[PDB]
Design an enzyme around this catalytic site. Sequence first.
Site: not given
Ligand SMILES: O=C(NCCCCCOC[C@]12C[C@H]3C[C@H](C[C@H](C3)C1)C2)[C@H]1N[C@H](CO)[C@H](O)[C@@H]1O
Ligand SMILES: [Zn+2]
Length: 1005
Positions: A60, A62, A174, A309, A439
């Site tokens: 994925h 972005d 997504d 991702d 997105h």
């Molecule tokens: O969802 C998407 N990607 C995966 C997401 C990873 C980030 C999740 O972090 C959660 C936390 C990180 C730190 C800070 C706080 C508390 C914890 C530690 C967990 C949140 C996709 N969708 C997105 C939409 O903008 C983007 O287009 C991506 O491709």
């Molecule tokens: Zn995305």
Amino acid sequence: CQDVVQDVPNVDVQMLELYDRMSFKDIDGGVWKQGWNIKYDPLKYNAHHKLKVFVVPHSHNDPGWIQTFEEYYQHDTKHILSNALRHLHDNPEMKFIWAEISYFARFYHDLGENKKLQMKSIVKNGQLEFVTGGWVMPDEANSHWRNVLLQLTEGQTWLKQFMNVTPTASWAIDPFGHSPTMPYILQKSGFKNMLIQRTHYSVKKELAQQRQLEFLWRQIWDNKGDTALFTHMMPFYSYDIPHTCGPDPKVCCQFDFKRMGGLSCPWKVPPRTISDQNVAARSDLLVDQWKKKAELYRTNVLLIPLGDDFRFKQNTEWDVQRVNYERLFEHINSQAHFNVQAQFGTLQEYFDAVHQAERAGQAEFPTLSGDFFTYADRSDNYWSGYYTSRPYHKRMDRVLMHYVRAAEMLSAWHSWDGMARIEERLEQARRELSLFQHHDGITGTAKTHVVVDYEQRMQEALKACQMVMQQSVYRLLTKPSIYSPDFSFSYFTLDDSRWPGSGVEDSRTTIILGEDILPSKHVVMHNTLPHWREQLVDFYVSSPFVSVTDLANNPVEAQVSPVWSWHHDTIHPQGSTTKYRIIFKARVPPMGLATYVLTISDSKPEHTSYASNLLLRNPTSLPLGQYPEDVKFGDPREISLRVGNGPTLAFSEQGLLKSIQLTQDSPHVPVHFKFLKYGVRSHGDRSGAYLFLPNGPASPVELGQPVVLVTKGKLESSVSVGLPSVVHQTIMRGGAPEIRNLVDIGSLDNTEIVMRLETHIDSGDIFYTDLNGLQFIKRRRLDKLPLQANYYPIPSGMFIEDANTRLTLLTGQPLGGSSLASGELEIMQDRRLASDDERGLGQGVLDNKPVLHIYRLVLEKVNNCVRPSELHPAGYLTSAAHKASQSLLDPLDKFIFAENEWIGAQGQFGGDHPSAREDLDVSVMRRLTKSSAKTQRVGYVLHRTNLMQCGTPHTQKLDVCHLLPNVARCERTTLTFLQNLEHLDGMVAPEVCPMETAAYVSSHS
Ligand SMILES: O=C(NCCCCCOC[C@]12C[C@H]3C[C@H](C[C@H](C3)C1)C2)[C@H]1N[C@H](CO)[C@H](O)[C@@H]1O
Ligand SMILES: [Zn+2]
């Protein structure tokens, strides 16, 4: 043609109806937190009825989010696609799907000839499979359908030109909720299947329980099922490997072989290398997950995505994923007791197998109509915030949308020498706009520097469109005997009174006239719509003594108003003593141009009137140089204004609409504008770029005693007030008024400013909102859901109605909105949020900036309108509200001739062009062929909306194939123009049905 008003379609799942039934209980379901413990009968499987498992690797990517497009390309994506090329070449059974053609073109054009041939080989033999093949994976909430088509057309034209492939399966893992606009455009673009992910956890549970996660998705008005597209909804919380193998993320995470530490498994059991020593036990655990997932679906064919991702970056990640999965497949396929056949596959492979199972009568799929908004990923975490986040760029999207249509339409009439660089300009323009459909673009969910990159690209794209438009106009309105162009010269500059807005940026040019130097100035108006239009236009002029003529010197009635700007200690208006607005009605042909002349005199000309100006506040004097009418003053009071035959509006003493009288007999119908504020929760989940988590209902904004400016004229009057954070303005030109908010949220942290309309309209729990500016869908306010779940996208409009009265609000920009009580509409203006909402953006929204929001307000009587059944899930605009949306999205373009004198000048273009029925639009006109091509080809997209018939039906048949001359052929095509659906006997394009979109390509010899 179907009727889309009387007959209600019959479908197994109607999403509004399903929403009424559903309890939306957030019960702990076990290992699958938002479902249940899946059980399967193990005797279901045997040597003659086996489970067929397609494991589909993906990455994925972005095109901007935490990093810009170019940063991600360099840090991540160029390595992912290098390694895809190497690893798939060497490993024939290995497979990979790719969605984002923006990244793939970037990469491919940088390859040596040898690598390009290798890449063509792994695409030809089906190892690397393109899914959707749009420039991006677009937002489906805020995006206009025209820009969805633009970005799909751009990616697919690239794939067809450079890879000789057109995907028929879509992958959308997504976007934050899903629009039926997508199947509508895909099914008319040759698509046979589509996949979606981010739907409400309670919707996933409900459909999973009935095995209705795969369904024939049809439009909410479609009785016949012609629009139907096979849709697969993935069942779980995420598209990541823990949430794609089966219901228990703790098990599935152990089969993500990249997580062998600096990534780990949150559930604290790591993945293990597959060995002869453990393959039996590892395989037992995994197949048990597969077989639980298969219970949720009707066939013996199972889709297992394998990705996350920016995955498949390291060549070692390719190894560790490929080698471990091969050992599992080798064991499982050789062990009869499993009755599984498992292998690496593609999305198309999955769908082909599912339809073989259907053809063989092993399943029949349910029908669905509706949308999948508003999305919640858990508890009360509804993603209604991004319907409004970064509203400056949301506005900019709609402005660039128009400029790209106008630039492609104006330049389409002629072939251009390549020294003009028309093709290059339009390619840049299409691609910058296409990228913003991502997105994390139009959604406003990107980091500050990425938003700035998107802004800068759109700014370059706007400038490219202006350059094409002004070249095209000079060519279309200059005698061929004189036309001798300098392709690098500005013949016209563009005048735009709505982007960015004089309140936002003091950037309009003053036409400087004087009896000695420059007594007259040519201006030109363009009308991209395929019908005659007569719209008020305005220009800045250095004197109020200006008269308007057409080129034939017929006098044109005009009004001069002052130039007002607002200023901030108290928020108060100041006048120019040096420039004025000239305002007059341009009559412009269909898809045509009209020339007019602004001329100075020493004194008041015969055909030009002057507005009065009333400043309500403890006054101090305000000069306006040569403006003949002096500013009157006074105390706040109630005011009524009328322009022409059109409505009479009454305003409060703070300058806010309190009533509308349609006609002279009829009543003063109450319609109250008020500004309120939502705040952020102190304890609990914090609102961010994505989530709207209000601390209870909005509370009114203290207006104080605001300075209310009233300008009154024969052609245009307005009421403006400087409220805290908002210069509110009601403009009247003799029909539905236009609302302008200059929105400066400043640093009111943890505040969302909303604009509400209060009426006595007996709407109840019903309101209507549009999807992607294509269709209006019935909403029902649900008191069982929190406030943020009753907020929906307002991409182009919203309305309420009882048996007698409708109020429709049309927008120039996508924003979030609801009807939170009977006879209310509300739409969010801006949001400033100190806190992150923990979806990975890693910041709040603290980069707000002044935006000029634009609206039309259409109060009308519907008692005499043929309205759909009380059971129809759709609504339809009136003629007046459709035309009002058209005047917001595709206004007349204005061109000021740059030079002192214009030899060759003509008064009109397109006089002979057919004036099509009001419900028909040429959405797209685009020349498909460069000059060096003996057969020129021009693509047209025709959309026909459906307007409520209200018994007041001057209309030439439009045939787009006969618009350009020397037609040799006419083909109906896919909306991408990439496939012929018929050579047309007659060389005529036929008229299209209500709510239908069709594309045609005309050839010329
Ligand atoms: O969802 C998407 N990607 C995966 C997401 C990873 C980030 C999740 O972090 C959660 C936390 C990180 C730190 C800070 C706080 C508390 C914890 C530690 C967990 C949140 C996709 N969708 C997105 C939409 O903008 C983007 O287009 C991506 O491709
Ligand atoms: Zn995305």
